[PDB]
């Protein structure tokens, strides 16, 4: 992209490990600023790099180090990772003449106690109730993704092979299945509402698709259960003349 790019999309690590995050500024920008954003907070400034120098640094300890290369691209290295480092890490680029800081898409870091805390979602679709169809002439399907950790999934709906946005609402935050515990798994729901006539056509195919961000090949895995890799999990229903 000629926009701000970052890699990787996500990282899952344990305490004490280290990470390097990468940023390329937007074409035409020469300054990069890194920020940490916790849930419910504003982005907190880590440092800014121009002409390969750290020009400003925010309230971040020495385990956050940075670098900017001659081609303007940048790295953020964090070591001796702590559980509290779990956050969205944002890169923003700017130039010396304009009023424009623009953010990249971010890298989500989870630092967890053990990779055995990582689980992919299970996904199920629940069919509209005949009571609703007869009461409203509308049909609501619910998709439920449960049991996942870390808490980043993206949920989409697909009707007869086409992604749909109309009639959809997905919870903006996953909910914690075990509120009282640090390594609680998560759930997320989404609804798709269609006319009862559309649901009542048995040729109509509805599929809830959940992208999970999990482990890769670089992660060791020696549990019995399947390695909880980055994956998509779907569920489906077909329409019915009831």
């Amino acid at each position: 992209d000629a926009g701000v790019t970052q890699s990787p999309t996500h990282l899952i690590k344990t305490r004490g490990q280290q990470v390097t995050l990468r940023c390329s500024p937007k074409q035409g920008h020469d300054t990069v600023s890194w920020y940490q954003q916790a849930l419910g907070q504003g982005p907190q400034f880590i440092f800014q790099y121009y002409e390969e120098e750290e020009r400003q640094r925010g309230n971040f300890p020495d385990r956050f180090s940075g670098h900017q290369f001659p081609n303007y691209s940048s790295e953020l290295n964090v070591n001796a990772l702590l559980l509290g480092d779990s956050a969205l890490y944002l890169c923003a680029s700017s130039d010396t003449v304009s009023y424009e800081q623009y953010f990249g898409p971010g890298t989500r870091l989870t630092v967890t106690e053990d990779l055995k805390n990582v689980f992919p979602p299970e996904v199920a679709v629940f069919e509209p109730s005949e009571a609703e169809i007869s009461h409203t002439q509308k049909a609501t399907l619910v998709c439920l993704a449960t049991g996942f950790y870390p808490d980043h999934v993206e949920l989409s709906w697909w009707v007869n092979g086409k992604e749909v946005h109309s009639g959809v609402c997905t919870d903006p935050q996953p909910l914690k299945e075990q509120p009282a515990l640090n390594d609680s798994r998560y759930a997320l729901s989404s609804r798709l509402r269609v006319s009862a006539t559309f649901w009542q056509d048995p040729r109509n195919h509805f599929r809830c698709q959940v992208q999970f961000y999990g482990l890769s090949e670089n992660d060791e895995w020696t549990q019995d259960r399947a390695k909880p890799v980055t994956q998509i999990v779907s569920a489906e229903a077909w329409g019915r003349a009831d």
Binding site: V125, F126, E132, L144, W238
Partner: peptide, 17 residues
């Protein structure tokens, strides 16, 4: 309204809307 929705893959599991 509150409705009950059944899992498309088994009747035993459900959700309330």
């Amino acid at each position: 309204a509150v409705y009950q929705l059944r899992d498309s893959k088994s009747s035993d599991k459900s959700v309330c809307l």
